[PDB]
């Protein structure tokens, strides 16, 4: 089976707008087959553990509307998954698609030698969009690249000052590339890949005393902390909100020891929590801010690491100290610029507050009626989670919701949690449908427990 | 000055424009320079200065002109002998890659990552078919440095249960800038500010099987057994360093003998550039893990791919979330890659890279004979070439004199005396000639400038 | 002069029991010069900062009585330094010296091939002397070597169980060799020698909640703690007593997480705090116990690492995994066997309880009279300390006690603190002289303060 | 039996000069039982492996003459083991014994506060005994401690110069404490205790071009070599001699790269290879020289780390940066001073050369005659080794020599290799008797093999 042949077959497919029954039967077969053979058979077994019958093999085909996805069988799903935080402004958002299309006609990828205007524009726009002294931007292609950039900026800055240790928090997720993975907290994701970067240590999230104890003990032993890295709200941890004033406290702790504050808003950024950045809630200015996911408007891959001139200036004397081939390419920038405009124009941060208040109320309500299955519902803005009592119940919830054509999924660090992360553009009727389908799934699950 | 809203709307409107007033052009250029200084990196403005003449430093990128040319905001058109450091193998805005991407953008650009996505499966089947021997499984990411992190993690996951933790790379090597990849990357400049890096990384001189065998033997004796060796078939940012014929095969045998894994970083050498689809096909070395990026995205999308045997990729099956990526293998990028593979094969671009590379290098080596004055030597394999000069400053002047002639070149990350020549594989034969003529005129100018300077 | 001439001159001096006034002048001259030129000019600077006038030049010549040292000028000192904790049964304790001579008559060092009986005899005595399941002994030559053996036993036991992290406490001193140094906590002793062993972390001494957090956080990130190591009371730290129930809580915490408990009793051991081992105040059984200093009766150098058979067994398959050339030699063992015998016959640990109480009563009294100069006095048995308001006041105390012919000295991890650490054999008569000497010292100190 | 009872019993044994037959049988029975239950049962298994019948349980009792040992049964063994390099001047050497007794009469251990004279005298004597600029001494208690001190000297010196990597050689043995173990090279000794000190790498012994490549690649990547450590002759490796001029080429390579040279003469030191130090053969001055074993005259444990003023001065500003409690105690200084005297007075390095050649000639003839059992014989001075065709043949040799009351034992990195390391004071008749015994042993071995 020649490689030309495979590529020609794929090009032929990419060009099909719609599939009929026999085309769908064949594409679904090839995709399951090739997943087993060339991608990961484990992912097939995973889908089985959160669906019922043939739903494991559901193959994603196209955007339906701003907030829906369609599989190869025409089945349309309401998206409460959001690509795990990617689709803040909806699927194929017309303003974003348009911007990308326009730039695609001029030049999608830059030479990396001439001065590329959209890099300059997005960095200007980001400077203005961010708190206080956050002034300089480095663009890359993902969240983990955003965090590697942050760790490196911290390292270049703190190294000549004698500081090499990094503090993160348990529950934290910061990416799976090996530097970012040193900060990431989940044991099962870390252990096979040890030894990781030396001098990374963890303290309980939300616990200012434990953090202070770590910075102070490190000082005593001559292992002074370079930087503290944390999410404002833990995402893959299961949507964990810290106590009030904790972020402000972590900011003061860091100034006190002369440590840098790195804030990872790859997941909480771009309006999802009810404000453009989750740090704007306590009005805290980190030294380095990590952005990705939704920054590309659900159309492009992109990441950005924004810092103070003070810190970022370590990159000035030699601008090749940290580089990236694709980072800040014109297509990625056009997507990011469109997304920032859409967010502001349509006041989507404010909408996420409003829609999130509604949905979490409906979720807390269902939690009360079904403590039979549901432990608790947490959230802020359109970042929410339902924590069930067992692992198996949460898997059954995902399964039942799937049958009702609502797409949800779990959390990387938390086995008992299903997330709810819809596009911020989710319509008021669609929020009603989601609570509706949530109830029905809970009811069906209850009935299954009595059934078994 | 403005709010983010006003800034985004200004950029959004500039994005829609196709051409520029003279006063619109002048305005934009002053913006780009100003914001590069205030919000990107003023040091980059300075680097552009040291490799240009006059306000050349502030040439601002506006659009692709043809397959092999770029146009700035002033309508100046440049023959691209930089190729985005190995990105534009099939040219700028190649119609088959643009079309595939545009068609997928109409369906779905990014996936949920939850449902099975069809193009991931197709690109994975296609790469299986494209790759030598037992390379069977593909992990998709967003960059070359991400590609190499995936390689290292795969090796780590496989070798740490077998009690092996040491990674051997080579000096001169460039494997990426993220902290995992940076640990294998070898340039002192790039490494020291971020130390300590990953433990267990050791380096031997490139292209020296004698030294590499000693390394692995010593590591075995002391109980610090070698998990994997990582190398580029040809060192790119190192200054286009060709290993002696026999090297890669010897590396394969050695890895076989000690039970080390062999990682080939073909992020720059891959997708046709050296005269084959992959530079390892030259000696027919099958690696345990193959890294791709740069040109795999067709010059339209960012993509990286890590391909490995089922034996090694295995480690990811029981828990498929052991290594993941949010954007990796998205439909837009998969389309761009499948398009690219098709074009490379249809238009037989690897074969073309061999013909055009022979001519171009033959041309440069002749010029080197003529100016021992300024040039040390010219080297290359297919369309991956470099010209080494006597001084960094002679080199910087070549880049500058070339830029004045509207031919784009640039240097290499681990060798300052070296100017890379990395044109699209689609560079026309006439353009090949033009580039040699441009290079000749530049060298003569340089000779005169050094004359008066002494 | 040749090496031979130097060896002969020094062999001549060793045979001399007493010095002419002229021989004395010349000896004190050569000793100061050779310290400068061949030992450490800096140790001469240190002594000056804690003596007055030419007192810095004092050169030690012989034991006087049990509790007494005599310099080269015939000047005699009551020893309240105890060699920083080695002279527990006094200077040249007759039973210990006798054991050592008798063994020297037979065989001072062993072959390491044939079975050396005194090693079997010492290992038997210590198994009988240690609480609970502590059963096997590895003999070495110092405290720091004793801690190295302990880290290795934990490493060899816990590495196959997937655990590599070590928790120690700030203020801790566990030795200066590079493995022990990784657990030793003073910044100033650690920085020039970094990178030390990886995987070592520090929590505050005496704070159990912080220790639970470190064990728990390590468990969460896959960095599971192999062992916890600590002194029951911190010596060099400044005689830092933990809360009641702390040591026991650490034992239960280790049990809970399946970490090994290492107890560093190099200073506290052999009767020093009022019991044979300080771990006996709460009846705590560590998995590994480290001994040295006083174990050699103030006559020989020796160390011992005692462990449960569960832990020590990691050395049975290949008894050559950890070894030492001089460890467990006949003279070291004779000395230790004599020391154990003397401590038990004369009920010396119990004496240390009584005399420590009485001595700490004198110092607490003086800290009452002189808040002028003194922060507080503390102690457990005969391991006591006086904390002063300043470093210099403490240095002044040390100099005044010296002028008063009572030998004291400072603590490695606390600059405001003067140890009082006399032989357990100190008479009540001398206890009262020591308390008078300290009052006179404070009297002169207060005066000199109000001169300025 | 109680701890007190155990100590009393041991003390009576220590007093008894002779043992009758059923005193022996009781003691022997004890020694084996206590080794089993409180020391290490594996030592019994190893000793069985290199003995025959009731030979495993040889229990040693006193020195016999200068060069012999007697066990509890009255069996006298000629000592070709030398305690693995300790007994350069024999067992209970009168001059060293007398120096020790005289010092025990005054002060066996010091306060560590007053200036102890014998530390100054030994440091002066060693300065005059050592090559060139080796001037300052740090005294400790073992070989592994003097390597520890050497690594720290280099670290303190090289850390501020930006260099942190250490190069050792495969085959090497430098001690078993975790710092020294990082440079020790046998896999068996290292693996279970990893992670060790970071930044330690190994190159093949005697191959200068391999060492240049490592030093050079390290520099390229920003991981510059702080220091190189090696033995002049590898001892535990199997008595591995380097090419002539290698040692000089390492000195020059270090000069060239600005790395420190550390020479480990813990085994080769104090006369054994024909000169006082094996570096004297090629006139090499290391920056740091390590000594132990024979430095203590076969009576005391001691170690020394001697360095140039350049290097050692990193300890002047803060003389407490590296310390050890027992290091340089009067008893150990007295034993070293006497050793230096005996070695020089009795011209014993010269004797080591003569007896070395004679013994090596003898083994070389036997190798020649029994190529069925013997691979080859190597050596320099009284450091020698016989390599056999396999392990078992080597073990049979050791066992046969033991039956003939000649004591030999293996090496820790090489299992086919038997070391021959007698006192430098071995008589010429004893030299001849060892060669005859080796012959009788080999003959019995060939015959043994014949039957099978
Ligand atoms: C608690 C403790 N551990 C370890 C040591 C190290 O003992 P040494 O100097 O004999 O190596 C000491 C010395 O102060 C000590 O007090
Ligand atoms: C999603 C996530 C990342 C992951 O980055 P990638 O784009 O998947 O490489 C990093 N940080 C946080 C907080 C995340 O939620
Ligand atoms: C460019 C390069 C990389 C890193 O690629 P990025 O996309 O810039 O992260 C890795 N390996 C090689 C050989 C490269 O040339
Ligand atoms: C024996 C040896 C050591 C270890 O000495 P110890 O006193 O047992 O700690 C160190 N270096 C060399 C060369 C040795 O032979």
Numbering used by the authors:
A (entry chain B), C (entry chain C), D (entry chain D): 8 to 459
B (entry chain A): 7 to 460
What does the paper say about this structure?
YgjG is a putrescine aminotransferase (PATase, EC 2.6.1.82). In this study, we determined the crystal structures of YgjG from E. coli in free and putrescine-bound states at 2.3 and 2.1 Å resolutions, respectively, to investigate the structural basis of YgjG substrate specificity.
The native YgjG crystal structure was determined at the resolution 2.3 Å through molecular replacement and refined to the Rwork and Rfree factors 18.1% and 23.3%, respectively. The buried surface area between the two subunits was 6,167 Å2, which corresponds to 30.2% of the total solvent accessible area. The YgjG active site is at the dimeric interface and includes the residues from both subunits. The cofactor PLP is located at the bottom of the active site and is involved in multiple interactions. The electron density for the cofactor clearly shows that PLP is covalently linked to the strictly conserved lysine residue (Lys300) via a Schiff base linkage. The PLP phosphate group interacts with four water molecules, Thr151, Gly150 and Thr332* (the asterisk indicating the other subunit) through hydrogen bonds. Similar to other class III aminotransferases, the Asp271 side chain is hydrogen bonded to the cofactor pyridine nitrogen. The PLP pyridine ring is sandwiched between the Phe180 and Val273 side chains.
